[PDB]
Amino acid sequence: LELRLKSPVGAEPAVYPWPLPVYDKHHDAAHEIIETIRWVCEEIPDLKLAMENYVLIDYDTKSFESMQRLCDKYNRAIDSIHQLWKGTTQPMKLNTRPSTGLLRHILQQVYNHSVTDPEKLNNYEPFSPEVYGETSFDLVAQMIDEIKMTDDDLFVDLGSGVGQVVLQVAAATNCKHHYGVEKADIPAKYAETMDREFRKWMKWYGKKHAEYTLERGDFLSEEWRERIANTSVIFVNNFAFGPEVDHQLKERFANMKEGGRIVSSKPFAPLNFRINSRNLSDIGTIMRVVELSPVSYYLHTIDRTILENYFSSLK
Numbered sequence: 094l095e096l097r098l099k100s101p102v103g104a105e106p107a108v109y110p111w112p113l114p115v116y117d118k119h120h121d122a123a124h125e126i127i128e129t130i131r132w133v134c135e136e137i138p139d140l141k142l143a144m145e146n147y148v149l150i151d152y153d154t155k156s157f158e159s160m161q162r163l164c165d166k167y168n169r170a171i172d173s174i175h176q177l178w179k180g181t182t183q184p185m186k187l188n189t190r191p192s193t194g195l196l197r198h199i200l201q202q203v204y205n206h207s208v209t210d211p212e213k214l215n216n217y218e219p220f221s222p223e224v225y226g227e228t229s230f231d232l233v234a235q236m237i238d239e240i241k242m243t244d245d246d247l248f249v250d251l252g253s254g255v256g257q258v259v260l261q262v263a264a265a266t267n268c269k270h271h272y273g274v275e276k277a278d279i280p281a282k283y284a285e286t287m288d289r290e291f292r293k294w295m296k297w298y299g300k301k302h303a304e305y306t307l308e309r310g311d312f313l314s315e316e317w318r319e320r321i322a323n324t325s326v327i328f329v330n331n332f333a334f335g336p337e338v339d340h341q342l343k344e345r346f347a348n349m350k351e352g353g354r355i356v357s358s359k360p361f362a363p364l365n366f367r368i369n370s371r372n373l374s375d376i377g378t379i380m381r382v383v384e385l386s387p388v389s390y391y392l393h394t395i396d397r398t399i400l401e402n403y404f405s406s407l408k
């Protein structure tokens with residue numbers, strides 16, 4: 094007893110067992126299935142012509158025969174489109190990145206299949222750097238929209254949790270490599286399933302992502318000092334890290350190259366910082382800081398021009 098969804102690009106079919114799993118109050122797998130079908134129809138205009146006669150909202154999510162008919166209608170449309178491509182028509186171009194709406198659906202799908210008990214994420218020690226909170230898809234999308242990233246960039250999420258910031262950026266951008274590093278056992282374990290589910294689903298949709306790695310580790314380790322130094326774009330949700338960890342992070346950031354960037358939920362230097370004789374050791378001497386469009390996040394850019402100009406002025 095299963096439901097199967099053929100891949101538009103001919104990857105292995107997505108197979109669901111029946112009954113379908115319960116996710117939470119607001120989401121179940123039957124509606125994920127319907128939304129997947131709707132999204133593939135967005136992905137492939139010709140699929141709409143084949144599917145346009147069926148009213149999706151009219152099926153019965155609680156009935157197996159009803160959902161199996163829906164899946165079979167979709168699979169037959171996929172076959173028909175595949176025959177169209179065998180003829181004069183040109184197949185869908187591979188290597189494309191997903192549209193933002195599709196990517197939001199993919200990550201929700203990856204998350205719901207991956208994090209089985211989301212309440213375990215709340216089991217952290219309070220008032221410690223392990224306090225867990227998730228940056229929303231929208232904030233990450235706004236960051237991707239507000240900062241340039243190219244194949245010359247290396248992206249790191251420090252304290253990557255279950256890894257969904259890394260996946261989103263890897264799907265949306267050209268960075269040479271994307272990484273995230275998570276110390277705590279519970280999010281790091283989930284991130285292994287997230288990694289697996291993401292590669293499977295992206296292949297099933299026929300969408301491309303840049304290269305990425307989700308690692309278990311401690312970003313304060315001796316090995317991570319050099320890796321931070323060599324990173325062009327750092328994302329860190331430091332909201333709960335506290336002064337000692339933020340101070341350790343400032344020391345690492347101080348080895349970054351000119352033009353290196355840090356996006357954080359709490360600023361590492363004041364926005365108004367004015368360099369003078371008293372503050373010369375502050376990290377504000379080496380970086381510009383601006384608030385991203387407002388929950389506020391901050392973009393820091395390594396600029397030693399600030400410190401260099403203060404010394405030239407003393408002469």
Ligand SMILES: Nc1ncnc2c1ncn2[C@@H]1O[C@H](CSCC[C@H](N)C(=O)O)[C@@H](O)[C@H]1O
Nearest residue numbers: 222226227228252253254276277311312330
């Ligand atoms: N020294 C350290 N090394 C690796 N991860 C750390 C760390 N200190 C704290 N963390 C992790 O940082 C995470 C912050 S919650 C942020 C999760 C994710 N990046 C997001 O923004 O959605 C927590 O999961 C915590 O375990």
